[PDB]
Every structure is written in structure tokens, then in C-alpha cells.
Design a protein around this ligand. Sequence first.
Ligand code: HEM
Ligand code: HEM
Ligand code: A54
Ligand code: A54
Ligand code: H4B
Ligand code: H4B
Lengths: 411, 411
Amino acid sequence: QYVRIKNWGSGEILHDTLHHKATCLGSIMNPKSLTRGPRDKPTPLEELLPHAIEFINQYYGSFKEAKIEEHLARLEAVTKEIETTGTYQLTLDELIFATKMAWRNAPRCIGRIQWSNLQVFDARNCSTAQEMFQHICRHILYATNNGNIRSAITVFPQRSDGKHDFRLWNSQLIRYAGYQMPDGTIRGDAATLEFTQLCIDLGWKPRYGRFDVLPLVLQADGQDPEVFEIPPDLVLEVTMEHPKYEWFQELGLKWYALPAVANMLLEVGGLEFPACPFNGWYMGTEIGVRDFCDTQRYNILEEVGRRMGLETHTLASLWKDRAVTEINVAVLHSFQKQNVTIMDHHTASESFMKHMQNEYRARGGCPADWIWLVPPVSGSITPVFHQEMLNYVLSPFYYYQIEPWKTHIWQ
Amino acid sequence: QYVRIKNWGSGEILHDTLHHKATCLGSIMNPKSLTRGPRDKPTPLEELLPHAIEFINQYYGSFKEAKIEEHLARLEAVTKEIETTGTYQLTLDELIFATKMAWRNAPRCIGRIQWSNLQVFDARNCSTAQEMFQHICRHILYATNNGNIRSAITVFPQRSDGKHDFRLWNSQLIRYAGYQMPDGTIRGDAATLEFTQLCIDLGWKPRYGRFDVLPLVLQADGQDPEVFEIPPDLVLEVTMEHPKYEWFQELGLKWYALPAVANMLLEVGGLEFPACPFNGWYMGTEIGVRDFCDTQRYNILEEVGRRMGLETHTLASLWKDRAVTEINVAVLHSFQKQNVTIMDHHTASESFMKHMQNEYRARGGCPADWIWLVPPVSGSITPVFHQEMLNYVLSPFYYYQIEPWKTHIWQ
Ligand code: HEM
Ligand code: HEM
Ligand SMILES: N#Cc1ccc(Cl)cc1O[C@H](CCN)c1ccccc1
Ligand SMILES: N#Cc1ccc(Cl)cc1O[C@H](CCN)c1ccccc1
Ligand SMILES: C[C@H](O)[C@H](O)[C@H]1CNc2nc(N)[nH]c(=O)c2N1
Ligand SMILES: C[C@H](O)[C@H](O)[C@H]1CNc2nc(N)[nH]c(=O)c2N1
């Protein structure tokens, strides 16, 4: 059967079949259903082996020209591998496939039309935190590409017993430090207060700035994490300026060009990769609305309002809506001016709609979390708002993890 | 136990207990879980009687000063009533309580801080469509109050066997007609195309305008529906003007002052009221963003853009965000100028947050559908966006219904 899905803007109807391949608390950010926690022992054969077979089938079934001999031979090899060793190793080709599929299956990602365009750095041979650091640097460097942003993923060694996990303690590859000031005030990124403390506690020298790039906190083979400063030549920044307001530059705002997730787990055919940093390119509203205007972040709304000469004390004036748009054009303008890849939320919405349509035609569905896909600003002025969606967990998938410091056994 | 809920903007944590009193497909507009369909026979005693007792307990348990004698006597009376007659009648006091509770339990309503402030018109003695019409007129008149908008509800007779249902075939008490033009174009409200046809098909004279107020299509005691024109002196309208753009008036826009839902079903202690029109007052973004800017409605965005002299062909310019805000200030300004109650989305968001906080303190929860509660524009600039919510069906509740024309047996 199917689930009937309606696009209220265009009246269009779609039939979801794909939800049958799946594995209200919808407005929860980090639900347990979206988390893949730690392990003390390897995954039971009873659950590993069927998952593995399904992946191999999915992998071979994706081929335009089917190769039955290779498929059955690989099915045989993998089965024998799991039954005798208690685990298995993917081929590079299978890993590349897994990373794209997991992105294709990320319900919270608006940039999925790009799913097939991903550079994969195989770091499964990695053994030390220094080698992890080198892989992360190469990733930052490749992905940054002097502002011509490229989507990439670095896949570190898979979880074995769960006592030898490779982990990136950071939220993101590039992110700013947040300090609780003696004044009671907060400096920089209020969202990294706890993690900034962790870095300081592990020997990081805090420069006490508003835009201090946090260090890499790398855990290799279950060992205690090691702190590494990101070479500043690798961190590309965009200084904020408005195309009409000269005073915008005076706010002294900047942002990093690279949106890279550092802390997620890639699940593929029973295998778990607890260290697999990935990136795309920015969507303007993420910096302009979330990073600059949330009270839990840089919180600049009032200042941009006052400087525009608006009624900052009457909500009914819509000064907040007026200010947010200027911040958003500034973000867009600044990235454009400085030759750095950025996408506006309107263009992204249309792109996702095209992708979703392609996905229903290609496989009878697209897992999509409406709450995440709808831009944080101008919702209904956007096609995705009027689109009914089905949110489900397929495989391969990118899961959240429990924060490493909460489960790590020290030395 | 409880469910831990986080407000990411203020870091605040709440514990939901109330979800235990309840009865992903979250982005679906009219799910079956939110619908209460028709009946051929009265509700089985096995399901009616326990629901009835729970309501009586809830009603008596709401008293500041408990009345055990009255409670047990009413429990006894109701039980005897259901066991012997197969149904029961609420007291006016119980009905008033039920209507407010159902509003308090409406997860999709941002105006809930007002839940206790509701005028209840008891029309349970109604027998004809002409009497229904008189009750609706009195409601429109009371609620309108010359622009000083008051929340009201008219409760028509409860469902008996389901073959004698009282129904309002309209979506809303006041709404504009939508016509498919010979030109292939659409005139007026594109969202009422099908229902406008139904009215024409039932003998309504279409005036072929952009703002033609639809007639009342009233079904009393299971009879065939009757068409009634709303007395125009009862329909208060706000003509749209911008406080700075003189050309805004030239767009020739207007909207009705009264947001009144006509088609929902009130469920209370096993009883179903399939005709119970209710209203509040407008939240600006509903007219400005949804009614004026959706492609499925009045679709004015491009015209407001051009007239502002903007890059209507480059999405990256953020012309849509620029235009929507002006439309929104126009809506707000026009209702203010014309002394008609309206609430901006920023003020409404703050109000709901205060309400939600009061609700967790008062009963350990607040059923809330995030997708609906977050304004259609300026999401994150709003406190409700950062609030994690739990969506569940309590009782009393306002359910959707299957469109009457789809199930009605004609004469
Ligand atoms: C190439 C351009 C891309 C764009 C414009 C894009 C954009 C986004 C945006 C806007 C979000 C919402 C993030 C948030 O609010 O926290 C997101 C989330 C996500 N994206 Fe993409 N994305 C892109 C590429 C990628 C890539 C390359 C992958 C993986 C290989 C990916 C995986 C995800 C995942 C897993 C999430 C959810 C993250 C979370 O739950 O915190 N995206 N993406
Ligand atoms: C007094 C001021 C009020 C405000 C500002 C308010 C505002 C709203 C808004 C903005 C919505 C979203 C509607 C949509 O997008 O379709 C809504 C939905 C709702 N409200 Fe309220 N409301 C108010 C009063 C009421 C009253 C008096 C009741 C019932 C007695 C009520 C019952 C509901 C219900 C049941 C829904 C969901 C309607 C649907 O699912 O289509 N509201 N309200
Ligand atoms: N915009 C954007 C975006 C693009 C790709 C990816 Cl992986 C994530 C993205 O956004 C998220 C926003 C989380 N606050 C993000 C994640 C990691 C680094 C920087 C930004
Ligand atoms: N705004 C608003 C609003 C206030 C109270 C109620 Cl009952 C409903 C409201 O909005 C809905 C929007 C549906 N498109 C509404 C329902 C019925 C008539 C007019 C407006
Ligand atoms: C698909 C999605 O459910 C739909 O388009 C929703 C989104 N949020 C909404 N929120 C409100 N208040 N009213 C609506 O009609 C909608 N439409
Ligand atoms: C409570 C709610 O889940 C939360 O505040 C969400 C809303 N939608 C979002 N959408 C995206 N892309 N990113 C987010 O962080 C959030 N935050």
C-alpha cells in the first residue's frame, strides 16, 4: 500500500511507498529514535547479519546494469565474514554508496538534491589523533576550496567493540568559542559555553574573543581526547557588510564559510562509524537568522533595529521582521562579494521540492522532517511549507550520538 | 513518569505529566487521528459510559471548592441516564466547561491564553435550518461587536443516531467565494472553488466578485442543507491600506474582521456535537501571509514587489521577504486604523509562551502542534520556535469531520 501526501500550494498529490523500508514527539531535537548510543561489546550476529545482507542487496540493486554473479559472491563473502569474525569490512565502492545514501536519507537536510555529489575521504586505516587531525585538515582544505565550497565526508574506522571508538568531540569542524564573562555577560557563541569549558579544562588557551575558532578535540581508538588548534589559514571567513548600510560593517560581524557536522554516526548494514565529519555549503538563514538573531547565540536583532531607526519597544511595529531581512541580505551580499558559496532559503526550498518530486518518481518517497526543512524565517512564502511530508528512518543513516564526555571512561 | 521538554532559547526545562491523560505523520493537515467521522447508530454503552464518568469527574474536579455530594449524585444520575436511555444531556454549566476545556486542549491554537474567556450560546433546542441561521446571525453580531472582537461558541444539538446531524457545510462562518473564470484564471478565494460550486449548485446567485461573502449552507436534524445569505450589515470588513505606501489602497484589498470556524465537532464525555461554530480574533500573519500570499489563495506577492520597485526575477534579492513584511504592516495598520481587534504574530508568540508556562504549572502539560503554532513567517525570531512541544489528543476536544457532501444521503 501507500500513504497519500498533499502539496496544498499546487494541489499536487503523491503516494509514499518507501516508508515500508523504515526501521507525537516530532518537535524534539535529539530524540532517542534519532540517536545511536555507545556499546561495550560488538553487535550480535542475529542483528548484524540480516542488516548486512539488506545493505549488500541495496548496493547491488542500485546498479543500472545488474551484476548477479558479483552480488551473490559478495553476499556469500560477507555472510562468511560476519559468521567467522563477528564483523565485516565494506569495499570503498560500498562505503561511497553508503555515505550518499545516508545523506539521501537525512530527513532534516534541505540540500539533498546534491546527494550524489560527495567526495569521500577513506580514513578507515587511521590509528592516532594526530592522523585524525591530518585527515580533518585535508577535509577542511578540500571542502573550503577558496570559497568554491565542495561537499565532502571523512570516514574514520568503524566501531569494533565500542571500547575503541574514534570520536570528534566537537559539534562542528569549525565553530566559535563562547565565554561566561566575570560581568555576568556572555562573549561569542553562547551555544558552545559547556564545550568551550571542556577545551579550557583540557589545556586550550582561550583568546577571550567574540570569534575564537574552537580547537579540534580528537579521540582515536577509544583513547583520551587530544586538543588540536585548527591552522588559521584553513579557516575561511566572511566579514559582514550590508550593500546599502555602511554602519553594518561597524557591528564587526563575521562567519566561517564552512558548515561541517563533526559529531554524527553513520550506520550502514549493521556497521557504525562514530567519527564521520561531513559538510555542504551554507543556506543564508542559518547564519543570518539562527546564528545572529537567536537569544541563545549572537543575539544582534535589537542593535540592527536601533541602527535602522525603528520602534524597538513596540512588537506590533514588526521591527524584528524588518531587521532580520537586512541581516539576511547582508549575509547573502557578503558571501557573494567575497566569492564564497551560499544559497538563499527561497532557492533552497525550490531545489528541495524538485528533489522530492524526483525521489517519489525514483523510489516512492522522501523521508522529510517538516520542522527542519521549513526555513527559520518566511515559512509560507516558501513551497516546502505547503508540502505534507513523511518522516522515517531508513538505512544507511546519520544518527546523533550521546555527547562523548558523558560516557567516556578516562585514563 | 514525565517527558523532559526543552526550550532552547532560554535553556528552560519542563516535565510533561499530562500526556498520560491522552486518548511520524505530524505534517499531515487532516489526519484520521484528528477526525471524528459519521455514525449510523448511537455510541455503544461500553465506550459512552466510561467517557461520560471521566468527564463528570473532570468537571467536578475543576471546582476550587469541591462538592462531593453533587459530584456523586451527578455520577449516579448520568450512569442511570446512559444505561436506561442510551445517552445523556449535559447541564449548561458542564457544556460551558466543555467548550473552554476543548479550546484549552486545541493543540493547533496559539490564542489559548484566552481559553477561559468564551461566550457560550446554547442552541441545543434548535430544530430547523432557519433557527440555525438565526443562531449564527446572533453569534456573528455578538462576536463582531463593532470591531471589538469577542470569542464565542454556538453549540447546536448533539449527535443522536448520526442520521439527524446538525451541520454547517461551510469551512468558516465568513469566507469569500472563489470562481474558475472562462479565461482559465481564478477570481477571489481559490481555496473555496469546490464549496463555491456547491453553493451555486444549491441555488446561490454568484455575484462573480473578488470578495463575495459565501452563503451559509445549513443542515438541521439530518435534513438536506439550506442556503442562506449572511445579512451584509453583519459582515465587518477592513479595507487594506499601508501607512507609507499610498498605492497599497489601489490594490483594492479587504478582509473580514471575524475568524470563525464553522465545521468542527466538539467531543465531550462520549457526546459529539457536529455543529458548534466558534471564533476568536485574527493574528495578522493569517490574512497577510496565508490569505494574501499563498499561490492557493489571493497570491499578491509579485504585484506588491513590482510596486515597491524590487528585483522580482532574482530570488536571492529577498524581494519576497521585503514585500511580505509590508503586506503584514498594512494588515496590522488597517485593522488598527479601523478599530478592529488584531494581534501581531510576535505578541501572540509571547502570549502563548506565558500560557504554556501557566499550563505546565497548572496541570503538567500543554498539547501543542509546533507546525501550527509557529507563525507562517519569522519563525525563529519568535519564542515558540525554540520551544520543544508534545502533541496529544485530550478530552473535551475539537475534531475535524469528513466533508458533509461526501457522506450526506440526499432527499
Ligand atoms: C551541499 C549543500 C547542503 C546544504 C545547503 C545543506 C543544508 C542543510 C541545512 C540547512 C540543514 C539544517 C541544519 C540545522 O538547522 O541544524 C541541514 C541538516 C543536515 N544535513 Fe544538510 N546540507 C547540505 C549538505 C549536506 C551534506 C553533504 C550532508 C551529509 C553528507 C548533509 C547532512 C545533513 C544532516 C545529517 C543534517 C541534519 C543535521 C542535524 O540534525 O543537526 N547535508 N543540511
Ligand atoms: C481569541 C483569539 C484567538 C486567536 C488569536 C486564535 C488563533 C488561532 C490561529 C492563528 C490558529 C491557526 C489557524 C490556521 O492556520 O488554520 C488557530 C487554530 C485553532 N484555534 Fe484558535 N485562536 C483564537 C481563539 C480560538 C477560540 C475561541 C477557539 C475555540 C473555542 C479556538 C480554536 C482553535 C482550533 C480548534 C484551532 C485549530 C483549527 C484548525 O485545525 O483548522 N481558537 N487559532
Ligand atoms: N546551512 C547549512 C548546513 C549545511 C550543511 C550542513 Cl552538514 C549543516 C548545515 O547547517 C548546520 C546548522 C547547525 N546549527 C551546521 C552544521 C555544522 C556546521 C555548521 C552548520
Ligand atoms: N488568525 C486566526 C484565527 C483565530 C481564531 C480561529 Cl478559531 C481561527 C483562526 O484562523 C483560522 C485560519 C484558517 N485559514 C480561521 C478559521 C476560520 C475563519 C477564519 C480564520
Ligand atoms: C503540510 C503542512 O502541514 C501544512 O502546509 C501546514 C503547515 N503549518 C500550518 N500552520 C497553520 N497555523 N495553518 C496551516 O494551514 C498550516 N499548514
Ligand atoms: C523545538 C524545535 O524542534 C526546535 O527549536 C527546532 C525547530 N526547527 C529547526 N530547524 C532546523 N533546521 N534547525 C533547528 O535547530 C531547528 N530547531
